[PDB]
Amino acid sequence: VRGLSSRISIYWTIVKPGDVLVINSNGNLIAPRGYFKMRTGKSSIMRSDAPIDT
Amino acid sequence: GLFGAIAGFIENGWEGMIDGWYGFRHQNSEGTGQAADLKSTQAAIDQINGKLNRVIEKTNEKFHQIEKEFSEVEGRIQDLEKYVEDTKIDLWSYNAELLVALENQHTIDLTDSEMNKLFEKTGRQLRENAEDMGNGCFKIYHKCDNACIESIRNGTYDHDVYRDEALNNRFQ
Ligand SMILES: *[C@@H]1O[C@H](CO)[C@@H](O)[C@H](O)[C@H]1NC(C)=O
Helix, strand or coil: CCCCCCCCCCCCCCCCCCCCCCCCCCCCCCCCCCCCCCCCCCCCCCCCCCCCCC | CCCCCECCCECCCCCCCCCCCCEEEEEECCEEEEEECHHHHHHHHHHHHHHHHHHHCCCCCCCCCCCCCCCCCCCHHHHHHHHHHHHHHHHHHHHHHHHHHHHHHHHHHHHHHHHHHHHHHHHHHHHHHEEECCCCCEEECCCCCHHHHHHHHCCCCCHHHHHHHHHHHHHC
């Protein structure tokens, strides 16, 4: 795929307030650069090809 | 309908009654005429608007839910997701069918009812001065001019004024 026979597998970890992340590796780590801020609310996702009007 | 007035002892509706749902037609010494009954018309209309507003009130608001279409076969978890959705849809579809069936039966019966109530109220005003001809018409046994007819229509008819005349015509 795009020249490549190798792959990256993606994982995720959520860390709550007062907890801590530890990353321990001796090779093959694709490291995070930071974190995404989690929110709760009314957001969602939908698959559609419909145009978006005003 | 349950009351047997509409499509009953009232043989048919009036396409020419265009200013109301229920009303009166008369023939007297001054000619013939027609008038809508406002109270009965509005009672039926008010009930129907009541049930309509109860039905079209408050759709539910839902946001993030479960996926309902899938591009790969997955087995057990997808099976369950699809079954949950199908089950939900069949239940709501049943609710919709039943809701309109019950509401509509009841709408027919309540309008039939309003027709019957107007008929009974008129009969009661007339006391011994009229007889029910059985087709939703009263034969009034005294001279009853346009103002008299209007007194019946507006609920102020005074039967005692006409009682001697009417009884003489009915029974002798
Ligand atoms: C009822 O009709 C009579 C006769 O037309 C009229 O005199 C009277 O004003 C009416 N009453 C009402 C409450 O409108």
